[PDB]
Amino acid sequence: EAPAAVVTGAAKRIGRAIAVKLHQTGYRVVIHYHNSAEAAVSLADELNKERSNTAVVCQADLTNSNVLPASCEEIINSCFRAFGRCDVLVNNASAFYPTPLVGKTVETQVAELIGTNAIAPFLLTMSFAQRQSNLSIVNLCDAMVDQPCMAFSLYNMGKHALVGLTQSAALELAPYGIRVNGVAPGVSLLPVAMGEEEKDKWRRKVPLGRREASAEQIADAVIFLVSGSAQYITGSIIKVDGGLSLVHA
Amino acid sequence: EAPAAVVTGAAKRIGRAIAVKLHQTGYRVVIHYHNSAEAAVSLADELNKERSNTAVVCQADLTNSNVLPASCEEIINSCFRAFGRCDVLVNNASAFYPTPLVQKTVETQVAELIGTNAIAPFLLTMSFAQRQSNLSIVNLCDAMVDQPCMAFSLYNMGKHALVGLTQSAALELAPYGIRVNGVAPGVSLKDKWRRKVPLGRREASAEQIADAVIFLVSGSAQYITGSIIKVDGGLSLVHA
Amino acid sequence: EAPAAVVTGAAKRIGRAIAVKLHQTGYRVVIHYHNSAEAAVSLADELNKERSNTAVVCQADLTNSNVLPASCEEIINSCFRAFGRCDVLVNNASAFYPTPLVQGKTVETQVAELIGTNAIAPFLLTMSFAQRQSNLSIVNLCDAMVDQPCMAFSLYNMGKHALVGLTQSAALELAPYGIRVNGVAPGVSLLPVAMGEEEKDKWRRKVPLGRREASAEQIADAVIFLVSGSAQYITGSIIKVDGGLSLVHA
Amino acid sequence: EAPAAVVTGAAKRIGRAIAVKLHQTGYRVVIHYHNSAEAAVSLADELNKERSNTAVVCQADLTNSNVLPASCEEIINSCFRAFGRCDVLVNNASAFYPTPLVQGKTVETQVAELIGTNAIAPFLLTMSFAQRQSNLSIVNLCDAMVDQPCMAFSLYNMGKHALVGLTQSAALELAPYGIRVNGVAPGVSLLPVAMGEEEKDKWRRKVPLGRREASAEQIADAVIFLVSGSAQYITGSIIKVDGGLSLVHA
Numbered sequence: 001e002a003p004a005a006v007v008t009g010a011a012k013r014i015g016r017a018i019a020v021k022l023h024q025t026g027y028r029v030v031i032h033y034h035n036s037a038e039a040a041v042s043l044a045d046e047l048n049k050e051r052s053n054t055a056v057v058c059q060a061d062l063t064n065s066n067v068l069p070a071s072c073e074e075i076i077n078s079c080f081r082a083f084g085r086c087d088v089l090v091n092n093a094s095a096f097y098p099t100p101l102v103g104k105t106v107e108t109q110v111a112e113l114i115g116t117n118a119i120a121p122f123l124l125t126m127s128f129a130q131r132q133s134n135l136s137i138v139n140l141c142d143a144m145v146d147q148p149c150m151a152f153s154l155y156n157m158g159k160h161a162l163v164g165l166t167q168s169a170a171l172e173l174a175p176y177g178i179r180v181n182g183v184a185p186g187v188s189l190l191p192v193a194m195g196e197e198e199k200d201k202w203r204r205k206v207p208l209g210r211r212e213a214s215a216e217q218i219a220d221a222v223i224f225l226v227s228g229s230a231q232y233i234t235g236s237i238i239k240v241d242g243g244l245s246l247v248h249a
Numbered sequence: 250e251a252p253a254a255v256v257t258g259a260a261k262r263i264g265r266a267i268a269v270k271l272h273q274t275g276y277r278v279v280i281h282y283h284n285s286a287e288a289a290v291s292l293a294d295e296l297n298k299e300r301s302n303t304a305v306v307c308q309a310d311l312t313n314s315n316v317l318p319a320s321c322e323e324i325i326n327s328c329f330r331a332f333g334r335c336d337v338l339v340n341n342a343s344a345f346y347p348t349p350l351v352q353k354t355v356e357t358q359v360a361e362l363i364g365t366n367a368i369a370p371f372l373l374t375m376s377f378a379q380r381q382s383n384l385s386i387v388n389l390c391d392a393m394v395d396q397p398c399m400a401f402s403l404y405n406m407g408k409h410a411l412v413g414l415t416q417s418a419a420l421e422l423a424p425y426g427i428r429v430n431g432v433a434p435g436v437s438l439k440d441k442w443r444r445k446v447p448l449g450r451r452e453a454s455a456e457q458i459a460d461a462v463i464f465l466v467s468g469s470a471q472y473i474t475g476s477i478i479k480v481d482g483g484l485s486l487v488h489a
Numbered sequence: 490e491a492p493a494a495v496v497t498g499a500a501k502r503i504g505r506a507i508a509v510k511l512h513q514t515g516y517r518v519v520i521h522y523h524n525s526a527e528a529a530v531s532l533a534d535e536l537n538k539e540r541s542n543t544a545v546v547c548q549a550d551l552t553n554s555n556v557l558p559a560s561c562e563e564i565i566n567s568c569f570r571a572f573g574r575c576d577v578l579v580n581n582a583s584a585f586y587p588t589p590l591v592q593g594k595t596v597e598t599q600v601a602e603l604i605g606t607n608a609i610a611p612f613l614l615t616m617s618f619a620q621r622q623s624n625l626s627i628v629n630l631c632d633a634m635v636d637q638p639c640m641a642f643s644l645y646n647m648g649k650h651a652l653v654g655l656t657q658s659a660a661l662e663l664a665p666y667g668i669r670v671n672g673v674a675p676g677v678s679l680l681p682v683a684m685g686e687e688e689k690d691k692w693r694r695k696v697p698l699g700r701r702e703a704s705a706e707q708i709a710d711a712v713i714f715l716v717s718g719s720a721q722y723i724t725g726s727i728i729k730v731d732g733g734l735s736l737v738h739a
Numbered sequence: 740e741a742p743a744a745v746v747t748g749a750a751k752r753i754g755r756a757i758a759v760k761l762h763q764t765g766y767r768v769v770i771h772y773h774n775s776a777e778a779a780v781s782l783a784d785e786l787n788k789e790r791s792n793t794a795v796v797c798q799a800d801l802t803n804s805n806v807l808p809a810s811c812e813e814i815i816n817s818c819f820r821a822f823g824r825c826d827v828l829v830n831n832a833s834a835f836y837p838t839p840l841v842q843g844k845t846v847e848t849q850v851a852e853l854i855g856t857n858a859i860a861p862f863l864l865t866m867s868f869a870q871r872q873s874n875l876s877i878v879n880l881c882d883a884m885v886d887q888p889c890m891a892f893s894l895y896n897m898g899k900h901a902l903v904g905l906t907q908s909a910a911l912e913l914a915p916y917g918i919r920v921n922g923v924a925p926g927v928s929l930l931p932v933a934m935g936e937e938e939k940d941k942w943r944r945k946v947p948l949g950r951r952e953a954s955a956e957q958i959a960d961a962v963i964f965l966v967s968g969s970a971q972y973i974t975g976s977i978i979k980v981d982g983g984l985s986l987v988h989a
């Protein structure tokens with residue numbers, strides 16, 4: 001009776017806030033993770049303490065390879081095994097690091113940045129759709145996709161590809177009652193590795209409050225798109241960026 | 250106590266559905282009208298029956314003229330007079346009709362399709378901002394702005410200007426805590442069109458439009474500014 | 490036999506560069522101006538010395554009013570009166586100044602100038618150009634920064650957005666008549682005359698490609714391309730000529 | 740000293756027209772091909788007949804694999820070995836076929852081909868071109884219909900969106916080296932040879948400007964503009980050459 005959702009990269013940060021908020025809304029959740037096993041299991045525990053049998057973890061590397069399609073099939077399969085249905089897919093997992101044009105090989109960087117950000121979402125969408133009410137998919141896009149960070153070409157290419165996926169899947173899956181939309185953060189939870197001075201630099205550019213989005217503010221937008229209040233919305237990407245993308249150089 | 254909202258063109262169709270849903274969310278509402286007095290009063294009567302003195306009407310012609318600034322000032326003033334505050338402005342009033350390039354005087358068409366659709370929103374935004382917690386403005390945009398209807402140049406120009414207003418005002422009013430966003434309908438703005446809509450199994454409704462407005466004004470959108478949410482069932486994604 | 494073009498606001502700066510380059514390409518030109526009469530006649534003189542009877546001036550206020558349609562009709566009529574044809578229209582004239590939302594022109598004067606020159610006059614000129622009708626085209630001078638606007642420039646930004654709308658709508662509607670409609674969108678080109686060098690340099694340093702503004706000739710080069718036979722399948726396109734400026738985040 | 744250009748997928752159709760036009764403009768050219776050896780060689784021979792020693796061919800599969808980076812480096816290197824320089828890179832090669840989301844080549848083969856040719860190979864060639872480095876520029880062949888995609892072409896559409904991102908990212912990053920990066924976005928150009936005329940006509944009828952597809956030469960014309968001295972302030976721009984097709988509602 002309770003709908004179920006898959007959230008990729010849900011152990012920490014934005015994915016975690018999305019998983020929590022979906023769960024609070026009445027969803028049973030698959031918490032996908034890659035490396036963060038301790039945090040993933042700890043979240044599922046917390047959620048199950050609240051309503052028993054409403055959260056499972058599922059481990060998978062979302063780097064592109066010849067076995068990525070089986071890994072994505074497995075993620076969707078894990079939701080059906082635990083819950084007997086899969087109503088919502090949130091493509092939240094992402095690799096993010098510079099790849100300048102001028103210790104990983106370039107084909108590894110391609111496999112990670114294009115695999116996680118675009119190919120895995122595509123295969124997960126395929127598996128989600130094939131395995132099939134208010135069905136929908138939400139992709140975590142990037143509000144700054146047309147004003148990209150310097151030396152982030154592969155990342156930016158993957159995020160552009162994800163816009164294409166959002167539009168193409170919205171068109172193709174509409175006759176099956178599956179809506180596909182995006183949420184596009186500007187600056188939200190900044191990278192762990194980033195110094196406080198660089199963090200503050202980005203914070204000062206944001207027109208609305210000179211602060212980053214909380215993870216919860218991003219999840220709020222995801223909640224809207226999966227809700228019955230968004231039933232005529234497909235192929236839309238909602239910026240949740242405090243106006244950052246509007247600010248000229 | 251309760252927040253207050255101005256909705257332009259609120260007597261019928263989309264503006265009515267927006268006024269109703271804001272009222273249901275707990276807003277006091279100014280129902281603006283130009284020609285539809287009976288409809289505006291009927292809505293106000295319906296809302297006041299639910300909760301006393303929570304709905305007023307306000308007449309103004311939104312055509313561009315030397316008196317448009319005064320009229321827009323009055324609309325915002327009427328909210329402050331009735332309710333002591335003005336938290337939300339919904340720029341919903343719209344004129345819609347073709348203006349072929351190869352052939353009402355043209356300058357009258359300009360006054361309506363640019364005046365009502367873009368200049369009135371600009372003047373209302375100025376007045377709203379001047380007279381100033383979760384403050385926001387929502388502009389009713391058009392999902393088909395980049396694939397426009399044939400021979401609707403002035404209309405299309407006004408809706409493009411309204412996008413520009415949404416972004417410019419989002420930037421300039423952010424320091425004041427005023428968020429500025431848009432909702433862009435499709436076919437809600439006949440059977441031939443519905444069959445082209447990807448989510449065509451669902452009928453388009455004014456309430457679906459209002460649902461997106463309600464989100465953008467809510468605390469669930471407090472970091473969202475300068476965004477335009479398409480509510481078009483995927484229509485804008487469909488090639489010719 | 491030579492084709493003819495109207496350039497609005499052509500007395501100086503980018504409009505002059507466009508009129509000159511069209512003239513060098515073999516066009517006869519209507520140099521429209523509003524206040525810059527000396528500069529306009531002087532440019533017509535230069536072009537007419539190069540080839541006689543190839544340039545005329547035409548004075549018009551492009552502020553919106555109930556007579557703006559007549560003024561726009563007259564500009565197009567001037568081209569047919571001088572040259573017997575009108576092949577190209579370049580909507581280059583523009584008012585540009587701030588209009589803050591929170592507070593000695595009246596607001597309705599600001600609307601009439603910023604929306605009139607930037608959008609309504611281009612619409613009326615387009616109407617008159619089309620109705621008076623080979624390689625026919627219209628080029629609108631747009632703004633590469635239309636989605637990352639200057640703070641407190643709402644009316645200017647609304648006008649330039651409206652011009653993108655006109656470009657697309659007119660391309661759609663006029664295509665059956667063989668009239669192409671395209672746009673050229675500068676980022677920073679010739680900085681305002683009233684701007685001091687220090688402020689100019691702040692803008693210059695933002696530009697990835699060479700940390701300098703576009704020359705007027707660089708803008709004109711893109712106009713020349715769009716009116717040329719090398720752009721015969723291009724309509725409804727807006728070419729940024731911005732040195733990468735619009736790609737730079739805050 | 741004549742400048743040099745690499746054109747990928749240059750044996751036929753659009754890439755061929757681009758190679759021809761660049762050669763006519765005075766470029767020496769590397770004609771890259773995958774399967775079309777006879778056509779590539781016939782083009783090189785025709786070009787060398789016009790001016791000896793101005794065209795070479797270079798075979799490479801541009802499908803993504805662990806050897807793709809080496810292949811792309813070899814394509815750029817072949818330009819330097821043949822001509823001593825490489826001024827222009829045109830990323831034209833493309834795979835195009837449907838990949839339905841709901842139910843041959845395996846899906847990972849489809850990924851390697853559609854994403855490899857359309858996006859990753861352009862990225863690797865851009866890296867190699869830049870690492871090797873006056874009017875240097877790259878032109879990527881994009882798709883004017885990228886936001887109104889064909890039904891069931893998700894991977895193709897993803898690859899073309901990725902290419903827009905590459906165009907913008909590389910424009911920003913390479914601007915300090917004086918390398919401009921732009922795109923040309925056809926709508927309907929040369930249709931498949933086997934596609935029935937009745938099917939070709941369904942697409943032709945949708946084009947506002949002339950109810951016809953672009954010739955390969957019309958696409959090449961925009962490429963020539965972008966690499967020319969007339970575009971030296973243009974970077975990060977994508978020119979639609981689509982006859983207004985992308986402006987047409989459903």
Ligand SMILES: NC(=O)c1ccc[n+]([C@@H]2O[C@H](COP(=O)([O-])OP(=O)(O)OC[C@H]3O[C@@H](n4cnc5c(N)ncnc54)[C@H](OP(=O)(O)O)[C@@H]3O)[C@@H](O)[C@H]2O)c1
Binds near residue numbers: 013033035184185190
């Ligand atoms: N934060 C921002 O400011 C911002 C801005 C724009 C867009 N976004 C987008 O919003 C989403 C969430 O942002 P975020 O900052 O929360 O993301 P994040 O913490 O950088 O990454 C989210 C998760 O992705 C997973 N991941 C990384 N590489 C992976 C791989 N090869 N296979 C499988 N999973 C992998 C990680 O899982 P494990 O920890 O389990 O290994 C990680 O916890 C992302 O899609 C991001 O691109 C965020």
Ligand SMILES: NC(=O)c1ccc[n+]([C@@H]2O[C@H](COP(=O)([O-])OP(=O)(O)OC[C@H]3O[C@@H](n4cnc5c(N)ncnc54)[C@H](OP(=O)(O)O)[C@@H]3O)[C@@H](O)[C@H]2O)c1
Binds near residue numbers: 503526633
């Ligand atoms: N320069 C830049 O950096 C830049 C950046 C983005 C976009 N653009 C666009 O490119 C185009 C040319 O730029 P620019 O700097 O050369 O323009 P500009 O010098 O600011 O203005 C060009 C001409 O517009 C005419 N004009 C102004 N108000 C008018 C009115 N009410 N009626 C009739 N004509 C009027 C003036 O003619 P008179 O002198 O005869 O009175 C003026 O010479 C404009 O459309 C502009 O918006 C320029």
Ligand SMILES: NC(=O)c1ccc[n+]([C@@H]2O[C@H](COP(=O)([O-])OP(=O)(O)OC[C@H]3O[C@@H](n4cnc5c(N)ncnc54)[C@H](OP(=O)(O)O)[C@@H]3O)[C@@H](O)[C@H]2O)c1
Binds near residue numbers: 747753802882925
């Ligand atoms: N034609 C149109 O209407 C249209 C519309 C939108 C966009 N475009 C874009 O414009 C560009 C040119 O269009 P087109 O129709 O002329 O292209 P096309 O003929 O479909 O393909 C161009 C060449 O790409 C090469 N190619 C394909 N797969 C390859 C692989 N795995 N490795 C290496 N090379 C490969 C082929 O080379 P070989 O023959 O040597 O094997 C082919 O001749 C393309 O990027 C296309 O996407 C075209």
Ligand SMILES: Nc1nnc(-c2ccc3nn[nH]c3c2)s1
Binds near residue numbers: 187
């Ligand atoms: N401007 C930005 N600074 N950090 C960003 C960021 C941080 C974490 C991310 N995870 N995925 N993508 C991310 C972008 S975007």
Ligand SMILES: Nc1nnc(-c2ccc3nn[nH]c3c2)s1
Binds near residue numbers: 583584679692
């Ligand atoms: N960023 C910019 N700095 N100056 C700009 C400018 C200069 C002259 C203009 N005339 N019309 N519009 C203009 C914008 S845009």
Ligand SMILES: Nc1nnc(-c2ccc3nn[nH]c3c2)s1
Binds near residue numbers: 834926927930942
């Ligand atoms: N609408 C379109 N019809 N055919 C198209 C087409 C034809 C050949 C291509 N090669 N790459 N991409 C292509 C698109 S696009």
